Amino acid sequence: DKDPILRRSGMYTVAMAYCGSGNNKAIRRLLHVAVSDVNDDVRRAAVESLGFILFRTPEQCPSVVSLLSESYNPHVRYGAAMALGICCAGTGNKEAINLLEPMTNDPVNYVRQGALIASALIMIQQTEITCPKVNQFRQLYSKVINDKHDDVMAKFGAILAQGILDAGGHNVTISLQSRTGHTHMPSVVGV
Amino acid sequence: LNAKVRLLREELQLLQEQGSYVGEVVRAMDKKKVLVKVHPEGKFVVDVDKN
Amino acid sequence: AVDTAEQVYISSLALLKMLKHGRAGVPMEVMGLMLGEFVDDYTVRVIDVFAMPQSGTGVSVEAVDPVFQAKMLDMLKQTGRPEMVVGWYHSHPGFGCWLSGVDINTQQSFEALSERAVAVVVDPIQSVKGKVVIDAFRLINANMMVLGHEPRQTTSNLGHLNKPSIQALIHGLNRHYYSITINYRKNELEQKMLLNLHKKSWMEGLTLQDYVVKEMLELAKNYNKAVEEEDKMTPEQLAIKNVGKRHLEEHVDVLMTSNIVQCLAAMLDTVVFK
Amino acid sequence: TRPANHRQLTFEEIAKSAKITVNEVELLVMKALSVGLVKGSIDEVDKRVHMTWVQPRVLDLQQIKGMKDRLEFWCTDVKSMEMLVEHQAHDILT
Amino acid sequence: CTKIINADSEDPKYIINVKQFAKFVVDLSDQVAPTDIEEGMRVGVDRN
Amino acid sequence: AVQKVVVHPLVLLSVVDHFNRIGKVGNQKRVVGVLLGSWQKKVLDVSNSFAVPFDEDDKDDSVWFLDHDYLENMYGMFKKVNARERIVGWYHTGPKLHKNDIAINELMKRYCPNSVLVIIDVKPKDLGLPTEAYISVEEVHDDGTPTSKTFEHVTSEIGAEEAEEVGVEHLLRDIKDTTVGTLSQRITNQVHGLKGLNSKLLDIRSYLEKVATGKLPINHQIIYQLQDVFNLLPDVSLQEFVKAFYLKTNDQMVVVYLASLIRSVVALHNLINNKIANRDAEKKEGQ
Amino acid sequence: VGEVLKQLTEEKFIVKATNGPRYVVGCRRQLDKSKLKPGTRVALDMTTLTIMRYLP
Amino acid sequence: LESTMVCVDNSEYMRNGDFLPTRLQAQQDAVNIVCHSKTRSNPENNVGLITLANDCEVLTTLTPDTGRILSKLHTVQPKGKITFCTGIRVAHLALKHRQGKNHKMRIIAFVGSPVEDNEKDLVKLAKRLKKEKVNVDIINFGEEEVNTEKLTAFVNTLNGKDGTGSHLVTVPPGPSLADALISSPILAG
Amino acid sequence: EFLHAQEEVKRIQSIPLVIGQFLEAVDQNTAIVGSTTGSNYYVRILSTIDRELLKPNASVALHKHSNALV
Amino acid sequence: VLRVTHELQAMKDKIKENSEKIKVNKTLPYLVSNVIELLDVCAVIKTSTRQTYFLPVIGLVDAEKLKP
């Protein structure tokens, strides 16, 4: 379809249909779309879909997202950060945070809130011993909600990041796969 | 490498911003203010940045 | 009763008319009115624009001629579908885009007339395809300043709106104003027609005379051979130098392409003809 | 009537076309070709024409030279070369 | 501030020059009595 | 007269916009409107134009209307906003030039002594240009054609302005030499072998179509005169072009020899440079 | 109004307006550079700075 | 509110100046007085016309002013034979294309030359107009289809049909005085 | 996209410029230049321009808006 | 009778042209000055700001009474 928004709808449909699988055809089509389509919105939707469809194999998600982490297009980087956050879910690969940290200083505010939200989603439920970095971001979050010179839209993600990290009294949790392996439709829809 | 090259070319966009004038500081007072005389036009008083 | 991160769609015809009209009367500071259309508070579109007649007054409200606009609207209703006049455009050639007292008065008058009365500012500052100095402004009343300026309910579009940020002179006069997001209206038939236009018209793609090409080629290759031979000294010295804690010259892609095309011309020479 | 190959015509061709002797062909071809209206080539070794350009009149019959005889059929060769090059270079063509 | 250098009947059409920039053919401001405007004395004109 | 015609993009945009506007009803199949320009030289230079109401009825292609009042009013408004402008002709859609055109042109002849007709295409396919410019003339033919009257084609171009390609071309553009000789030659051969072939086979069918439908196989000296100049080269047998032997063969051979010599030089230089950017720089074990 | 201070290039030349500022401009369509030797009165538009009718 | 499109004749037959000093002048003053009556009826009533002489090009639009009507009424130069069907179809398309379609529709015709004998063609052409309930009256001055009577039934076929009815005026024999010619159209449409 | 950026940079300097005298160089990509209007501006220089030619006072054209050395 | 129509038409173009023509004088940048000289296919004006401008259009008023 010619309309960019219809293309975004198609990419989301691709993601949802192939949820929780590594269908090579889906990955190829999605990556080609992200590379080519001029409309940055379509590219961002595509990379989000890529993050969605490869959550059952989180270890590989950072590898692909790495190159996207450093691109000319800010929207590409923002969508890459979100894709990493959704793919790794709550388990900390120790590389997701590793890549996010430098990404957590991008000049563009859009990328700023993207990285904040991604880190908050990833680090949920974690602990200091389990992930040594949890303190930093925590402190980081505080400072970004304390400094005034920061962009208001940039900080708008920091508060949500804090809330997610400590959401539900450190009891609730995000997980798209049931212990029996059945994929959690509610989690997918929510994300 | 060539993403870096593209980024450098993009950052060359700063050339769009017009340059600043040149003025010899006649005298700088306290409270973050200085009276300066730009060459084309008479002197005036300006506020200083944070750098 | 609340503002947001709204959008204005501009038809390619509209922007082309605006820029050509502006360039027409750059010294005179020309102005005119558009014929826009309402869809929702979030979005509003514009398709057609006419030129209000030149007047020595300038951008004064009196410059609008009720008989002229009435006649133009009637004629358009007769032929094609017109639409209510969204607002006014003018060219501020001084530097970039901003507004003045007269401009704000005119905008306030139109806002009394209608809802948006969006203002458009253009300038002679242009690039071949890389300036689009055009911009859209809208005023804010001083009664609700206690209330939030522009109630925002979307991060992506608000951030995109801020990405242009505000111009030096814009801050110099940003108050009583809040720029509104602009975007080129969807364009497929016009886009396709233009794309066909480029190949044959806006650049050499006649495709029948598309193929000196053997007269000056010898000389161009002579120059480049000599230049590369000279440039070969610098890599020589660079290699000569030891570890010690301008070799990059390329100049070979150009020769590659030029002479490979010239050789390929044999395909036309020996088969396509005769 | 006939370009290339037979376009090169022996002097006796001009002799027959001008009811003049072979030697008179040699002696008269000068003036005959003098005319001052058609420019081209002629090969006095045999007075072979293979002339370059002429100003022709109406073409006889339904444009015999017009159809595949001279034109048209070469469009087939053009198409063949085009498809060949396209298939060969498809990779770079993109 | 400007200096008046002439006046004309019918429409006053003064030929005032401001300081040295240029002579301007400017009409009297709406809220001024024509009697006050005269020749060769200081007066005040706004730019626009 | 009017050897060349140049159309500014604004004109095409306006035409297509009005066509889409009237698309509500497709019966018209035409956009008849007044087209304005300037006589900068013997070349016309078209500029802003507009569409006036009209009708193109199939009933003998003679039911046509050009509201004089609307035409005059639009003329006056445009001149008031743009004095330098003035009528230069009229334009219509429906690529197949409906037979009414002649009659309509006569009306324009009154408004402008030499008014040209431009036919624009809403949907461009490839090659050439969406526009086509025709001028109505009357005379007496040397051959003997009764009334020697018909529209004559006049070449066309596209105009120039500032800051317009940003509207579209910012989306896509490939200005460079990578495709030169990669795509340019391909499009060239394709367009030739398609359009020239189509014209030649149309004339091939015409050789008897002149008797069936077309004018006449021995008809319009321009037709067969142009065919003959085309066959300025024999196109068969020796062809006296590529069989010239010591004349053409040797020339091509020297040219290709030089091109291949520089090719070898550049290949060797690229080899050395890429090796140095290679191992010299890549063979860093760094303990 | 200004004068052709020098012929920088066949496409662009250095000129100076009577006011004093010096710019680089170019022929519009055909300004006959053969006759626009260094020093030639020409009037330039104050929107693009292009060479127009030349009058000595 | 009425809008009318008249179909005058300017033919070599009209080159004759028989009726009054000039048959052309007879058509002229007939059109003039009918326009005056129309203006009196309603100031914004629109009047336009064309000549069916070798062509039916609308001479101009339907303006609500008499001065244009008379001004254009001059400069006739009658040289072309009549074409009634094209004239009437052009008048109908002008009436429909007219912006003021609310204005009552009417068409006049100042024909002055022999007409197409075929009555089937005219009947088919104008009975459709009757279906779309259009009013048309035809006036004949000069050397026309001699004292046309076959059109009379055709008149009922285009205007009438136990309905309104639009009278048709042929050429009276010999000289014809304008006032007599024009007493009819006002008397009956 | 890289090629597009390169050609855009090249075009940046093609627009009609304003002559003026460069005053001195502060640091790479930056300098002080005096215009024919007499005012002295603090501007930037493109990476393309080459230093030794810039160092002498000489003459230089500036962007009529950015004033950047070209 | 069409004569009076054209002459009544004259109260048409003149009124609009007058309004515009009576603005340059009033406007501040009027810079009423001396015409440097006159030419033909045109005016040359030294504005009172010490600037020389060339006008292709010699001027709205007819050029006969434009004394150098």
Short mmCIF file of C-alpha atoms in Angstrom, two decimals, chain F residues 53-55 57 59-65 67-69, chain H residues 55 57-61 86 89-94 97:
data_model
loop_
_atom_site.label_atom_id
_atom_site.label_comp_id
_atom_site.label_asym_id
_atom_site.label_seq_id
_atom_site.Cartn_x
_atom_site.Cartn_y
_atom_site.Cartn_z
CA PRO F 53 -15.65 25.63 -17.91
CA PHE F 54 -16.15 23.69 -21.12
CA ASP F 55 -17.83 20.75 -22.81
CA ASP F 57 -19.52 16.31 -26.62
CA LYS F 59 -22.05 14.67 -31.16
CA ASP F 60 -19.95 15.63 -34.18
CA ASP F 61 -17.39 17.17 -31.79
CA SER F 62 -19.06 20.57 -32.22
CA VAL F 63 -20.70 21.28 -28.83
CA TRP F 64 -18.00 23.38 -27.17
CA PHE F 65 -18.28 26.32 -24.78
CA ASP F 67 -17.55 31.29 -21.28
CA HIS F 68 -16.35 34.64 -22.58
CA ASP F 69 -17.24 36.43 -19.34
CA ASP H 55 -21.81 27.58 -36.97
CA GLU H 57 -20.81 29.48 -31.48
CA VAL H 58 -22.35 31.24 -28.50
CA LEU H 59 -21.80 34.92 -29.20
CA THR H 60 -21.47 35.46 -25.44
CA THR H 61 -22.86 34.41 -22.08
CA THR H 86 -26.56 22.57 -33.81
CA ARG H 89 -28.31 21.82 -28.95
CA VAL H 90 -25.71 24.50 -28.21
CA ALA H 91 -28.42 26.66 -26.64
CA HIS H 92 -29.57 23.76 -24.46
CA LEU H 93 -26.03 23.03 -23.29
CA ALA H 94 -25.52 26.71 -22.52
CA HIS H 97 -24.13 24.94 -18.02
#
